[PDB]
Scaffold this active site. Structure first.
Site, PDB file in Angstrom:
ATOM      1  CE1 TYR B  71      -4.164   1.389  -0.193  1.00 26.06           C
ATOM      2  CE2 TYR B  71      -3.131   3.158   1.040  1.00 26.06           C
ATOM      3  CZ  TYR B  71      -4.144   2.694   0.250  1.00 26.06           C
ATOM      4  OH  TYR B  71      -5.210   3.471  -0.130  1.00 26.06           O
ATOM      5  CG  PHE B 131      -6.193  13.967 -25.993  1.00 21.52           C
ATOM      6  CD1 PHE B 131      -6.394  13.396 -27.240  1.00 21.52           C
ATOM      7  CD2 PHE B 131      -6.698  13.314 -24.888  1.00 21.52           C
ATOM      8  CE1 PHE B 131      -7.059  12.189 -27.390  1.00 21.52           C
ATOM      9  CE2 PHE B 131      -7.354  12.095 -25.015  1.00 21.52           C
ATOM     10  CZ  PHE B 131      -7.542  11.536 -26.273  1.00 21.52           C
ATOM     11  CG  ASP B 132     -10.857  14.542 -27.729  1.00 24.90           C
ATOM     12  OD1 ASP B 132     -10.016  15.197 -28.382  1.00 24.90           O
ATOM     13  OD2 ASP B 132     -11.596  13.690 -28.276  1.00 24.90           O
ATOM     14  CG  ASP B 222      -0.855  15.526 -23.265  1.00 28.76           C
ATOM     15  OD1 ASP B 222      -0.313  14.419 -23.482  1.00 28.76           O
ATOM     16  OD2 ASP B 222      -2.102  15.623 -23.261  1.00 28.76           O
ATOM     17  CB  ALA B 224      -0.056  10.349 -24.619  1.00 27.08           C
ATOM     18  CE  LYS B 265      -3.681   7.278 -25.292  1.00 29.89           C
ATOM     19  NZ  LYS B 265      -3.694   8.758 -25.043  1.00 29.89           N
ATOM     20  CG  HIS B 457     -18.802  11.317 -29.482  1.00 30.27           C
ATOM     21  ND1 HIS B 457     -17.547  11.089 -28.950  1.00 30.27           N
ATOM     22  CD2 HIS B 457     -19.310  12.351 -28.769  1.00 30.27           C
ATOM     23  CE1 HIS B 457     -17.314  11.945 -27.966  1.00 30.27           C
ATOM     24  NE2 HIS B 457     -18.374  12.724 -27.836  1.00 30.27           N
TER      25      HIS B 457
END
Ligand SMILES: [K+]
Ligand SMILES: [K+]
Ligand SMILES: [K+]
Ligand SMILES: [K+]
EC number: 4.1.99.1
Lengths: 465, 465, 465, 465
Positions: B71, B131-132, B222, B224, B265, B457
């Site tokens: 933990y 990014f979204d 960012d 990824a 990614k 979507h």
């Protein structure tokens, strides 16, 4: 004290070591006298928590290997949906990466839903006892967290079958005082973690739900330890004497509208959570909208497909009675070894941990000098066992005065992971604590070196007096 | 088109099947004509995303088996901290269950930190392209997300080495217009996802950072697809011609103050995220406080210890030049197959996907009738391949009027998972798309069978016209 | 040449590397110009064999995790028994650690059984073509191994549908010459390995069995590549055009009384073997008595319980038609690439390997200077690919003369593991061989540096002439 | 009786169940009253053997995942070769699928090598006590197996430090009687399995070797339980009181010329064997020639690459003093519980099992009616525990008399797998047998329902008299 034999055998081991006394001393010092900062390499038996440290079976590992990692429509998402319907009879699920992720998804939604109607002007949440993350989410969303566990819970040494029960009188009083319009939800915590893992009876769950339905209040079942709760119902309620654990579980969930669940507890996982909603499609829809940005797409919810697969198998294994009998009888064994030697504990023992009253062990140490933490630190230095404080160190300061908040009980929690340690490890823990009996008298107490403004418990550095 | 051979061989396979055309028809019929709602058993080759569907190596799986589930203080947390120091030279890390969990941790903290000083009264975040999920966290925290990618990105067929670059003129204009006091942070997305996985050059990163430091603006990378970005710098920037991928990566991170990373990614995982902070201890401390309620305790951050262990191995594997050359050459192969046959794509191809312009293939279908999706569905019915719509269906309605926003592009994204599919699977996707040419002309357009107000979507039911 | 797409995708990879020319020279030298002595680390693409190097599926590895390791009575032993009943309709099984272990159990027992009756005074075994270990066990038990494969097999470039068939005229002659009393058994090798992995037709299997039952001769089906054989029957025999692969398999095993099987071939394993006996309980009982001292207790036969579990799943996966079509199509793709560049191969290509007729490539090298071995070493040096000699090097010396025994064919076997390499790896191999075209004429030839008395093909040290 | 705590914790479990009495009865009936023919699913705790049922660690499983399956030159083969050099100082290895495979490889080779010189006309093998497979290989090669364990071994209740020792006087007498020329090899079995897993002292091993070398006799160390033997040397020999286990092991192998090893015992594996030769290259070369046809190519020897990799790690873990102390202490715990209750056992307990005397528990059952098997069966019927009878039912029939051979002992062997069962499973077994005390008197005895010729004990169906 009675040892109960494992209904399984070992298939894989992990080596553990006892660091030397010198190594433990150096490590504690380095960690600022706070076991939460110790590296796991400085620990022999870890009793910090029963969360995510459980041992999985070969069937859970096999289910991980064939898990579907598909971004959308994973096979294991559908299996999990069917499992939740089978166990709880709930029709909607949203996976979450762990319990506090499930809280993060559902709680803001329940508030927004109550507010949409024009209600929830001075919003509160009511629980038998809110777990720490649960209360944190209640407060982060601007609400008040009220805890109304029976007062039988605070009488440590006196046996009661159901110390996790809601005080029904206090529930009715709170509803009248705040108004049903301001109660966002009632959170039924099973077993009642903060009262020492004590069970909530079926009749108490039912009465709480009936009252909630008379006032239109939404009920959420915080279900990290729902199987330990169902075992205790079966063991102590005559009405369920001949029922299977799944029958008990099925009835329990008749008394909630939704559940939040840390699958890191009873479902025997290392990671994983779940939101399940009985039949309110609107709440489900809103919770899905929040799931997307916070956790992940709705068919994986921040979990790998292998963890959803393990979750499906863990949900079945966590309900097996032979396993639960052994698991809870092991915690009782530890409790009984301690009790039989004169160490005061919360009695009877709950499902997953033994709580030791450190006030009675170190009377010379005042609350504000953290007596439970001094016992824990000595235990560590003496045996390499890591326990965790549930006392005035954790409680923190009064914001109004800036003074140590008053702590009724100074507990040391001995938290036990599922299927990891044998009864001989339990004997090692009990012997180490019993052995400190003539050292208790000389223990000094601790001071702050670095006191963080919030979440002090986790990173404060301390120093003995 | 040039096929590049795998620098590995296969150790474990997973079976996939082409459902019969009636199954496909039935499936798509039953999925309400929207592939984001199909189950993975209805799909043959899945190109929905390159997130978390990667194939791991035997060393990654071996690292999972010995991962430490403690933990607090897991061994794998310390290894991850050292790996982040080695790769980026950043001193603080906070694991997260995935990239959007890292955004949820850091973004609110950056806003609060900018406001603490009295600034950030009309707060904005500026990126080459958000990014979204990134833009969603910006907006959820009451800020504005501004995208200033070079205009070269919108010229699909015209080659440019660096289509993910920030437009430096627009950056300076936005700083003057909003004021440095309102810019919570600049987000450098590498590679630039939303522009087609197009690289950001080293000199552009450096210029953006230098400008940010003049104005005291905090810069977040960012990350990824940082390794695909570094491959492209090494391939196209003469200055890095003889550098190793790790040298490139090391220089890139001199141009940011922190990073957010989806480890689903480039680090080749199925789950996993990271926040790393270069040297701002105060931001680290505040991010840690938010980490606790949202993700988990700070030494695991909503990940199993086995996933931190795989992440350490994955971060190393993701930087290997032979693998990156193969991976990116495979995406370029699919692109070249399409291009050679007369199908228009964003060119050159980015690191992880091929983007296809569907306006040009179905002129008779207007934006509002979903040209890309009609291409996507057709592609699904003919081959079992599931691609994703980046167009009018994804753009959504404008809340002001309820008007179907206008997309300047009606793209079909062919997203490729790492080390999962062969060049022959790539030929199957291209031939299926090249086989539609006769049918493009007879393509209809779709209507809404059920449309939701958000998550359109993901969940909208549609029907052909 | 036509590339066929994988009916699966990759779930786990294993890194492979091309050692430099400098490393390959050094290694081959150290291995005394014998690729069998190279460490796997000096090899890029390994085509030494298709035995035990296959890639299992996720279901196979899952089956291993839950495998029962019980010494007696393993659950997986009963599953394997039922699987053999389902596939072959045989009622008795004896697991073995691999195919030569199954030979070692069964062959001595068949000899003893024939001798018990007073027969087998000058004992022989007859096959279409005995694999090497099979012939070794025949000879070690003091018997003669006779091979009577059709003469169509020796006409490399001339297409024939059934080059693994037995020559029926030679069968009848051998029975008359040796007497049925001296024929211990007939061994039907499917596919016929030594002839280039060429199929044996159903009507030939049937004719051989009918003749054997007229003279009371026992028939054993050597079944390492039974699924590849069954695919070829379905593909080339009009009678099985619409049959499933399992139907074909079920009919083939009507024409034997028992089977020996290397499960390291068609059942897709890394280790594992099987003895199945149709209905002769006495042979079973004697084979079980020999199994104990040589292999292990009869319910595991020298295998871990996880390997019996994987074998049950592998048996089923090895029969899937889409997989066999792809697999055999990959081998034909490599063969067609070579044939189209004028590289003479055994045609048509068998089920698991491409055999390059090296007598035609290297005319300047006479048998005793090992022409096929000269090609293999140059191929290794040029590309890192490792292949194996099926020629006079392997044939070894004549026991009468002590000089090079004369070799019919001088083949180079390009053996293809199942589900491991892509068609891009096949292109690599084909391009390296094709790129040696001009060098074939000047190839020098090989001498011994060290020649072991027996099995010299595995350990001799050679030197370039 | 003292319980020793595990120096590891549990990482993976396997569920086991106690069949119902009903089920227990049905199953045993169905099995023909013989537990070697029960399926594992009717058994709760399995004490049939300590061979291949061990639990591996996470490090062993990880090593399997990255194991090299190469047909020739596997990386794991070289690691294993180095490991055998490190542990024993032996220069040559040949992997084998299990210990009897290793015997099959080496024994025929030792015979042939002695015969090559013109010796071995009436060939014998001498051991302290040949294990069952070992004696079978000796006899199958036409040799006589002579056992000369000290007579102290037959005095069950009398303590002796070294009950596995060779009787040196009988050694010298046998050499004089048969002649050194007829002694193919001396086989030193450590620990001495057939004497109850009793250790052989260092000084006895040394003396036996010295005598052997004086006569030119080759010495083979049968090493299945070499680590348990080394533990006992360190525990009882004052000379090795401060030595590490590895030091003891290193000295032990000074007193042999080669080893045969079942790696299914002390190396903690489920499958696996090894031949290691100290320095005789000619024996090695001959053994490699036999390895090829019987086991596999010489760099894997009938094992998957993953099993060699596990063996390398298993060999290191099996030497760990803390593990050995626990393992051997657990067996001692089970023996002390029985002895403290008045059950007669071989004393002191050996390394891997407890041997009980059923002759004294049920004096009313003659040898021919199977006294130990009636204890076992009732043990099985009352507890679900499966043990193995080492007595008259095992013993058989004298070859020339054909009557029930006289069994000196009527021993029930309680064999304990490594790291699989806890001390509570040990109590469950001790209690089951102790609680039979009253009930023993009423036991009847058993006859044969079906008795096979030489596969008696594994196969005979029996019924109660
Ligand atoms: K964990
Ligand atoms: K995933
Ligand atoms: K292998
Ligand atoms: K086994």
């Amino acid at each position: 004290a009675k040892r109960i034999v494992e209904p399984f055998r070992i298939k894989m081991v992990e080596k553990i070591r006892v660091p030397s006394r010198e190594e433990r001393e150096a490590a504690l010092k380095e960690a600022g006298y706070n076991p939460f900062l110790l590296p796991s390499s400085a620990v022999y038996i870890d009793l910090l928590t029963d969360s995510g440290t459980n041992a999985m079976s070969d069937h859970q590992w096999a289910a991980m290997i064939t898990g579907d990692e598909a971004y959308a429509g994973s096979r294991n998402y559908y299996d999990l949906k069917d499992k939740a319907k089978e166990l709880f009879n709930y029709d909607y699920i949203i996976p979450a990466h762990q319990g506090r992720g499930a809280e993060n998804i559902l709680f803001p939604v329940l508030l927004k839903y109550k507010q949409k109607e024009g209600k929830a002007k001075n919003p509160v949440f009511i629980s038998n006892f809110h777990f720490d993350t649960t209360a944190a989410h209640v407060e982060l969303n601007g609400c008040k967290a009220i805890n109304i566990v029976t007062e039988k819970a605070f009488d440590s040494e006196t046996y009661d079958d159901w110390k996790g029960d809601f005080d029904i009188k206090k529930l009715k009083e709170n509803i009248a005082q705040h108004g049903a319009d301001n109660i966002v939800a009632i959170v039924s915590t099973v077993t009642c973690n903060s009262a020492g893992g004590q069970p909530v009876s079926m009749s108490n769950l039912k009465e709480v739900y009936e009252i909630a339905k008379q006032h239109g209040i939404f009920v959420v079942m915080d279900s990290a330890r729902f199987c330990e709760n169902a075992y205790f119902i079966k063991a102590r309620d005559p009405k369920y004497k001949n029922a299977t654990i799944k029958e008990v579980i099925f009835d329990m969930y008749k008394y909630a509208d939704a559940l939040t669940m840390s699958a890191k507890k009873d479902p025997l996982l290392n990671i994983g959570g779940l939101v399940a909603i009985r039949d309110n499609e609107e709440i489900f829809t809103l919770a899905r909208q929040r799931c997307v940005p916070m956790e992940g797409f709705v068919t994986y919810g921040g979990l790998a497909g292998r963890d959803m697969a393990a979750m499906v198998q863990g949900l079945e294994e966590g309900t097996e009675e032979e396993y639960l009998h052994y698991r809870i009888g092991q915690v009782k064994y530890l409790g009984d070894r301690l009790r039989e030697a004169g160490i005061p504990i919360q009695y009877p023992t709950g499902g997953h941990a033994v709580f030791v009253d450190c006030k009675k062990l170190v009377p010379q140490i005042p609350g504000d000098q953290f007596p439970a933490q001094a016992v824990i630190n000595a235990l560590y230095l003496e045996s390499g066992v890591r326990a965790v404080e549930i006392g005035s160190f954790l409680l923190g300061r009064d914001p109004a005065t800036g003074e140590q908040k008053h702590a009724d009980m100074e507990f040391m929690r001995l938290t036990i992971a599922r299927r990891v340690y044998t009864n001989d490890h339990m004997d090692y823990i009990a012997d180490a604590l019993i052995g400190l009996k003539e050292k208790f008298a000389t223990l000094k107490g601790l001071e702050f070196e670095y006191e963080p403004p919030v979440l002090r418990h986790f990173t404060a550095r301390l120093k003995p007096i």
